[PDB]
Every structure is written in structure tokens, then in C-alpha cells.
């Protein structure tokens, strides 16, 4: 590739980093340093209290929620020996999940997804992980995460997380994220179940608006889940010195889970295409029915007006005052042609 | 043979800027033979040929500077994409300038050719006016370090000015898209969707022009010819990232425009329903009435409907009754 240089964007100082995001409301740093027998946990807002955890024998977990503060992330990167380009990728939000291996750390970018039923908004939030020799750094974007089970496991000494190093912590965090992807998928299931009956019963503009926004949402889900699958494949097929061989079997389960997730996404895309077809069919059927009404009226009453005009023209030679002064046979002709048209329409099974 | 392909065939002028660390000479001439010995100056020089339709001047310039006629064909081939060709003598570059005006939402380009020879740069334009005015000001008034450097830095400055013009065009397109988003999400119409189509075509052309530009910059800084020389490579590395920014913005704009166009265009069958409902509710209540008029307009002698207790008001009352019941029935059908 290239030599891992800085971007040097335009209209901007040569060596500055810009937070490429929207959330600029909250900031906090939670440190959870756990060992075999005892642990510490605290939440502060000053970065000077979390740096001395770099040279910690016991595994520790430093969660910086809120990366709009470029000063704190820059200080953390300077202390922990993080490359400036890695910091730039940490702050840059508009990028797909990815994994990079370095000498002293492994740097991963993943994404959380929150589906709000109101307004049907699928929000994506980057979460970045850096696994160092002893400590795991997680940079979030805003308050709210899916690692509460991991925090409960660490606090309550549940599972085997308290007697394993930081690589198992990274595995647990990635596993929690992939597990929450399943909850996102089942929410998509429920919303699609809601959508289908509205599509096939109330075909209006909001229906196709929602359907197309959801097609875009599933395209985004595919585009963000395939790189996650590649990340996990590179994770369990490489085995950098940072992670030990005793944890590699744990990543295969996460890989299988992501395989299942990708299959579910493909099924979702197929269902979405079918649903759009259903909408088109229903709308065409409605216009076909109103069109039946129009063509029935036109077919029945066009030849009648034709023959009325035929017998209504001013010509000198009318064989008209014949067969009971003409009018009754004309009325009978109208009646017989009308009943013929009605019967023919009945033989076709509409009106 | 040399044939001009473009359509700008009304302007021609030669502009020469020979600048050193302490001296500068700028002039405008229309004689090809006067500017030829400028290769003798060890100091960098900048020759600008504004008119391509005068093929004699470019032919003579190629003859004197010794460039293989395929580059002449490429220069005169206006319909092209940005490209880079490397030779043991000179570097050939084809770029595209862009012009955008807010009133008439249309985009027009202008191919510009650059040839970098030993201590010399030649640029072939197509008409009066370009985007290299800041470079001219920097050379003339000794603002930056352009004088202290050779012609490679001059090529750098020209490409950088072109990229800044690309940024300005992107700002204009951003304003256009911001207007169009509300214009189509509030009051959709045929004119708005036509503007959306035009914007999509403009974005397609812009991306088709910007991707080869990124490739040209990559080839410019990655594998360095002796002409480029090391001291300019860190500068050429920046324009690649500028092109990265431009390409990312173009991709985002294209995605937004495509999404908006699809969102509008996926709602044609509802309009079909509306027009069918209108035509049906209008023609359903008038064909019976015209039929009744035809029945009562026949030329029948001794017809029963001669005079029956105000027959005309009775007939119009009957037709009004049937029209009223038919129009009421359609409301029951939600039409």
C-alpha cells in the first residue's frame, strides 16, 4: 500500500485532527481495572488520572465516551504510543469497520446500530478499540453502549473474564457487539412484519417512502456487516502476538455469528424486493378496477350514442315511419345491445 | 495530419512568463517564432497557448520542442479524460477545467494540456480565461517560493490552482443540492425532476473527470521521473489528498442525488390512479347524459315526447338526478 502518512486535508491546518461527527454533548472516562481477586472501577473527566494505567500488570479497560474532545484523545494517543494516523481514523466516523495490526497494539473500528421505531431511524455510531499489551482502550461517540453484560460479568466475577488477560476482554466486547446485532436484526424482523400488511392493504406515499428508506438501511447494513466479517476473519486467521492462542477458538464463534447475520441480511433484501413487488401489484390492481368501471361505461354507452346520432341526422329519405312508427324498434335495439354488453361483461367475471 | 476536435475556434494568444529569483519578464505575443528560443533560459519559463484552433502554432511548437506527434493528436482530441504520459524528455498531462453558473444549471468543461520539458512548461488552453490567476499573481509579485524553484514547482502550482477551482465548483454544486433537496421534498414537479436529472448527469461527468485526476496525481508522486525531482514530491503528495477529498464529496453528492431521484420516481402509479379516477368520474357521468340527449334529439315524427307537463324541465330534472346519484356513488367508492 503506502507508508501510513497523515491526510493533510484542505482548508485546514497541516497537522490538526478534526472530529468527523455530530454528537458534541457528553464526555466521560470510565476505568475498570480487574484482576484475579480484586478490581477497581471509577468514572472521571480528567485524562491525567487514566494515563498511569498504561504500565499496569493487571488487565484494565479504559472507556472514553465522547470523542468530540480531540484534546483528550490526542493526549491518550501521545501517551500510549498510538500512531497519529490511527488517531485520525479513530476520530473519523464515516468509515466502514476495519482492523489493523501494529507492533504494540491492534486497532479495530466497529459500529453500533440503534433502530428507533419513531421516525424509523437507523442511527450508526462508530466504536473504536485499541488492544495494547495490558490495557484495552475503547473510544465511543456518545453515552450509550451494548457492553453492560460485560460490565456485569466483570463486577460480579461471573464467567471466566476475571482470570484472563486483555485479549479475552477484546473478545468479550466484540462478542457483545455481535450479539446486539442480533437484537437489531429481530427489530428489523418486527418492523418488516409491520410494513408488509400496510404495503398490501394501504398503498400510499408514506408506504413507499418507508420501503425505500428501509432498502437503503439494509444496503447500509450489508456494507457495514461484510467488513465486520472480514475483520473477524483476519482476527482469528493471523493471530498477532498481542492475542494468545488460547483465545483464537473464541473468535470462531463470533465469525459464525456474523456469517448468520449476513445470511439474514440477504434474506431481508429478498423480502424487501418482494414487498416492493407487492406494492406495485396492489396499486396496478386498484387502477385496473377503476379502469374496469371506465371501460364498462364507455363500451356500453358508445354504440348507443352512435346509433342515436345515426337516427338523428337530417336527411330527406327516412325509412323511419315503419314498424310501428319506428321508435319502439329503436328502443328495443338499445335494450338488446345493452343486455348483450352486460351479459358479455358478466361472462368475463367483472360487473 | 492534425485535426482540431473542439468547438472553441474564436480566440488565440500566446502568453510568456519567464521568471528567475530576481527578474521576471511577462508578455503577450501572437508569433510562434519569437517564443521558441526560450528553452535557452536555464531559469524556468511558462508558455501559454490559448488558441488551439490555430493548428500551425501548436505544430511548430511541437516541431521545435521535439514531441512525438501522438501527443499532438491527444492535445487536439478534446473529448478525453485526464491522463499522464511519461517520456525520457518531457511529461505530458491532460486535465479538464470546469465552469458552472447558478442561473442556467449546466456544466461545461475545457480540456487543458501541460507539457513539462527541461526547465520549461507549456500549457495549451482553449479560450480566454483560466483558473491560474493566483499563480500568475504569485509569480509576478513574488509572494511565495515559486521564483526560487524550477518549472516542476510551476507545474505543481498549476495543478493546485486547478484543484482549488474544483473545490469552488464543488461548493457551487453543494449549494445547488441544498436548494434542490427542499425544492423536491416540498413541491415536486416536472421541472424539479428535470433539474434532478441534470444534476445527476453533471455529477456523473464530474466523477468521470475526477477519478482519472486522482490516478494522474498518484502516478505523479509515486514513481518519480528525473524531471519531477525529489524536492517537489512532498508538495505533489498534497494534491493527491485534495483529489481524495473531492472524490469523496462527489460520491456523497451522487448518492444523495440518486436517492432523491429514486424517492420521487417511485411514485408514478399513484399519479396513474389519480388521473384514472378523475377521467372515470368525469366520463362516467356524461356519456349517459349525452346518450339521453341523443335519444331525445332524434328526427322521429309523432314521437311520444311532444309536450308532457313541462317535458323539458322534467328531462333536465331526470338527468340532474342521475348525475347526482352517480357523483354521490363515487364518494362511497372513495374516488
Amino acid at each position: 500500500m503506502e507508508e501510513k502518512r497523515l491526510s493533510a486535508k484542505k482548508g485546514l491546518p497541516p497537522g490538526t485532527l478534526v472530529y468527523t461527527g455530530k454528537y458534541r454533548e457528553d464526555f466521560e472516562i470510565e476505568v475498570m481495572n480487574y484482576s484475579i481477586e480484586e478490581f477497581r472501577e471509577f468514572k472521571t473527566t480528567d485524562v491525567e488520572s487514566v494515563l498511569p494505567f498504561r504500565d499496569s500488570s493487571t488487565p484494565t479497560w479504559i472507556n472514553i465516551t465522547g470523542i468530540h474532545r480531540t484534546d483528550v484523545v490526542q493526549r491518550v494517543g501521545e501517551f500510549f504510543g498510538i500512531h497519529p494516523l490511527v488517531l485520525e481514523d479513530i476520530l473519523n466516523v464515516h468509515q466502514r469497520p476495519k482492523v489493523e495490526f501494529f507492533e504494540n497494539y491492534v486497532f479495530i473500528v466497529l459500529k453500533m446500530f440503534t433502530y428507533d421505531k419513531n421516525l424509523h431511524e437507523l442511527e450508526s455510531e462508530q466504536v473504536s478499540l485499541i488492544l495494547t499489551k495490558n490495557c484495552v482502550l475503547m473510544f465511543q461517540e456518545k453515552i450509550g453502549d451494548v457492553f453492560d453484560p460485560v460490565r456485569e460479568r466483570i463486577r460480579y466475577n461471573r464467567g471466566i473474564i476475571r482470570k484472563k488477560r486483555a485479549d479475552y476482554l477484546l473478545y468479550s466486547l466484540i462478542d457483545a457487539l455481535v450479539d446486539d446485532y442480533f437484537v437489531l436484526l429481530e427489530k428489523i424482523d418486527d418492523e418488516i412484519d409491520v410494513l408488509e400488511e400496510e404495503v398490501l392493504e394501504r398503498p400510499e406515499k408514506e408506504t413507499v417512502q418507508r420501503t425505500h428508506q428501509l432498502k437503503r438501511n439494509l444496503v447500509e447494513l450489508r456494507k457495514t456487516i461484510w467488513p465486520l466479517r472480514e475483520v473477524l476473519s483476519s482476527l482469528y486467521r493471523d493471530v498477532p502476538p498481542l492475542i494468545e492462542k488460547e483465545t483464537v477458538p473464541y473468535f470462531r464463534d463470533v465469525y459464525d455469528h456474523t456469517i448468520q447475520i449476513a445470511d439474514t441480511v440477504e434474506t431481508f433484501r429478498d423480502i424487501v424486493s418482494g414487498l416492493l413487488d407487492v406494492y406495485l401489484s396492489s396499486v396496478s390492481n386498484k387502477t385496473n378496477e377503476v379502469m374496469k368501471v371506465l371501460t364498462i361505461i364507455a363500451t356500453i354507452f358508445m354504440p348507443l350514442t352512435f346509433i342515436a346520432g345515426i337516427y338523428g341526422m337530417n336527411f330527406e329519405y327516412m325509412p323511419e315511419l315503419r314498424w310501428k312508427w319506428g321508435y319502439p324498434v329503436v328502443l328495443a335495439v338499445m335494450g338488446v345491445i345493452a343486455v348483450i354488453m352486460v351479459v358479455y361483461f358478466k361472462k368475463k367475471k367483472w360487473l | 495530419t492534425l485535426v482540431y476536435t473542439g468547438k472553441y475556434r474564436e480566440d488565440f494568444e500566446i502568453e510568456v512568463m519567464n521568471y528567475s529569483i530576481e527578474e521576471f519578464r511577462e508578455f503577450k505575443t501572437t508569433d510562434v517564432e519569437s517564443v521558441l528560443p526560450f528553452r535557452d533560459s536555464s531559469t524556468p519559463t511558462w508558455i501559454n497557448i490559448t488558441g488551439i484552433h490555430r493548428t500551425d502554432v501548436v505544430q511548430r511548437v511541437g516541431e521545435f520542442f521535439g514531441i512525438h506527434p501522438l501527443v499532438l493528436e491527444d492535445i487536439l482530441n478534446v473529448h478525453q479524460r485526464p491522463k499522464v504520459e511519461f517520456f525520457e524528455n518531457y511529461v505530458f498531462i491532460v486535465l479538464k477545467m470546469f465552469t458552472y453558473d447558478k442561473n442556467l444549471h449546466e456544466l461545461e468543461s475545457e480540456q487543458v494540456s501541460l507539457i513539462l520539458t527541461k526547465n520549461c512548461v507549456l500549457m495549451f488552453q482553449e479560450k480566454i480565461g483560466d483558473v491560474f490567476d493566483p499563480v500568475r499573481e504569485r509569480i509576478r509579485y513574488n509572494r511565495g517560493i515559486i521564483r526560487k524553484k524550477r518549472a516542476d514547482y510551476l507545474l505543481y502550482s498549476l495543478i493546485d490552482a486547478l484543484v482549488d477551482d474544483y473545490f469552488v465548483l464543488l461548493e457551487k454544486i453543494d449549494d445547488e443540492i441544498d436548494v434542490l433537496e427542499e425544492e423536491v421534498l416540498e413541491r415536486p414537479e416536472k421541472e424539479t425532476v428535470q433539474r434532478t436529472h441534470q444534476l445527476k448527469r453533471n455529477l456523473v461527468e464530474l466523477r468521470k473527470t475526477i477519478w482519472p485526476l486522482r490516478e494522474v496525481l498518484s502516478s505523479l508522486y509515486r514513481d518519480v521521473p528525473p524531471l519531477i525531482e525529489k524536492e517537489t514530491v512532498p508538495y505533489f503528495r498534497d494534491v493527491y489528498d485534495h483529489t481524495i477529498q473531492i472524490a469523496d464529496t462527489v460520491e456523497t453528492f451522487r448518492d444523495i442525488v440518486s436517492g432523491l431521484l429514486d424517492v420521487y420516481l417511485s411514485s408514478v402509479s399513484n399519479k396513474t390512479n389519480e388521473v384514472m379516477k378523475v377521467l372515470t368520474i368525469i366520463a362516467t357521468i356524461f356519456m349517459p347524459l349525452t346518450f339521453i340527449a341523443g335519444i331525445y334529439g332524434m328526427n322521429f315524427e309523432y314521437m311520444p315526447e311532444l309536450r308532457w307537463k313541462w317535458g323539458y324541465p322534467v328531462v333536465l330534472a331526470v338527468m340532474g338526478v342521475i348525475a347526482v346519484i352517480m357523483v354521490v356513488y363515487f364518494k362511497k367508492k372513495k374516488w
Epitope: - | 453543494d174 449549494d175 456523497t252
Partner: antibody, heavy 126, light 107 residues
Framework: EVQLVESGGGLVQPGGSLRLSCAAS????????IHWVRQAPGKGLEWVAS????????SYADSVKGRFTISADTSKNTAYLQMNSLRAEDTAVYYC???????????????????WGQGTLVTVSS | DIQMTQSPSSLSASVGDRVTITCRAS??????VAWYQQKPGKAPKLLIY???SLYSGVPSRFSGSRSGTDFTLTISSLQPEDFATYYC?????????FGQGTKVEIK
């Protein structure tokens, strides 16, 4: 926690140079831009200068270009503005603001000033 | 440079009504417009950045909208604490410029 405090304002004769110091407390000046904003008495806000301490890249308004000078000292966490050849209309209150870059598109960025200083009044007369 | 013409130059409105102030850029700015509020005799307080987003720590009544080069600030329901001078600022270029201000009075 973050505080911006200016100093150095006072009466100066025309053509006399005085330095305005913007002491920065609660943050590191190296990670943020520092902008000076001049407000004439009874007039609207006007931008005058800017500085990026990380790279030492300055930006001056056309009204003070080549006459003023802005410098930032990361060691003492302070940004200094030097106003040589001070003229008559420069009499105004000077605000020091810390700005942060935000992202709009891949090609466009903008800066917004979170915290402003108290503002020191500079008077040029007599 | 870029001139940011702000209108109206002075607005009068009581408490509880919607107030709209507009500023027009001379040329294109890519939504890099911020809105600041200054009480008489105090430092300005930032309200709007990116011409739509809301700064963290201001009432939600303030809103920002953009249409081409027209940037509008709207207060949905005024309060006695919202009678100050409002300034636009374009930051697309390195040389940033301010609006001339819009003092909001009472009736």
C-alpha cells in the same frame, strides 16, 4: 473549568505598539485554535486574527494584514497579539476565543468559537 | 472576501412569539455558518454551529435553517433572557466574517 483571560489593554498613542496576551486556563492551547475578535464601541463584531498553535499557521483579516502579528506560546499556555502601527479606528474591545473544527462534507470544514474571554478595551486617542 | 448581510438590522417583538432573523452570504458557503448571541456589555455566547446543529447547553427553542445562501435563526417562544444581539459568522474560508447584528427589542 476552561477560562480565557486577556490583558495588556490601555491608552496608547497612534503608531505605538502594545501586546495583548490571552492567558489560557483549563485547556492546552496546542490542541485548539485561538481567534481574536475586535468589537468597536457601538458597532458589531469584527474578526481580526487567528492562530493554530500546533503548526504555527496564522490568518489575518484584510484590515490588519501585515500590521498586526499573532503568536502563541505553548510553554506558558498563552497566545499573544502584537499590534504595531496602531491607528485611530482600532480603538475597540478585543475578545479572545477558542474555536473547534467541525465537519460538514469531505471537502468543507468550519470552526465555531465555544468560549470567549472577558475582553480588554484598547483606546487610541490624544 | 465574503460579506454576510444580516437582516433585519433591528427587530421588535414581545415575549412568546416566533422571531426569524436571516443572513445572506455574498458567495457560496458550504453550510459553515454559526450564530452567536451577545447581551449588551458581555462576551458573545455561541448558539448555532453548522447552520443547523444546536450547541450543547442552549435552550431548544433556538433553531437554524439553511436554503442555498440564506441562513435563518428562529426562536419559537421568546423569554425575557432572549433580548440580545444576534450575529452570523461564515467560517468556510480561513478569513471568517461576521454579520452586522440584529438587536431584539421589546414592545
Amino acid at each position: 473549568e476552561v477560562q480565557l483571560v486577556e490583558s495588556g489593554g490601555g491608552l496608547v498613542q497612534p503608531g505605538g505598539s502594545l501586546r495583548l496576551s490571552c492567558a489560557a486556563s483549563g485547556f492546552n492551547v496546542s490542541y485548539y485554535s485561538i481567534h481574536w475578535v475586535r468589537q468597536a464601541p457601538g458597532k458589531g463584531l469584527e474578526w481580526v486574527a487567528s492562530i493554530s498553535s500546533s503548526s504555527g499557521s496564522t490568518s489575518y483579516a484584510d484590515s490588519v494584514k501585515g500590521r498586526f502579528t499573532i503568536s502563541a506560546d505553548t510553554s506558558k499556555n498563552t497566545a499573544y497579539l502584537q499590534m504595531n502601527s496602531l491607528r485611530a479606528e482600532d480603538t475597540a474591545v478585543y475578545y479572545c476565543a477558542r474555536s473547534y473544527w467541525y465537519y460538514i462534507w469531505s471537502y468543507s470544514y468550519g470552526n465555531a468559537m465555544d468560549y470567549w474571554g472577558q475582553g480588554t478595551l484598547v483606546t487610541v486617542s490624544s | 472576501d465574503i460579506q454576510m448581510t444580516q437582516s433585519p438590522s433591528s427587530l421588535s417583538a414581545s415575549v412568546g412569539d416566533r422571531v426569524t432573523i436571516t443572513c445572506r452570504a455574498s458567495q457560496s458557503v458550504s453550510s459553515a455558518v454559526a450564530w452567536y448571541q451577545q447581551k449588551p456589555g458581555k462576551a458573545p455566547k455561541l448558539l448555532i454551529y453548522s447552520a443547523s446543529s444546536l450547541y450543547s447547553g442552549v435552550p431548544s427553542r433556538f433553531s437554524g435553517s439553511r436554503s442555498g445562501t440564506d441562513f435563518t435563526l428562529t426562536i419559537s417562544s421568546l423569554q425575557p433572557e432572549d433580548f440580545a444581539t444576534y450575529y452570523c459568522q461564515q467560517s468556510s474560508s480561513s478569513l471568517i466574517t461576521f454579520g452586522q447584528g440584529t438587536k431584539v427589542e421589546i414592545k
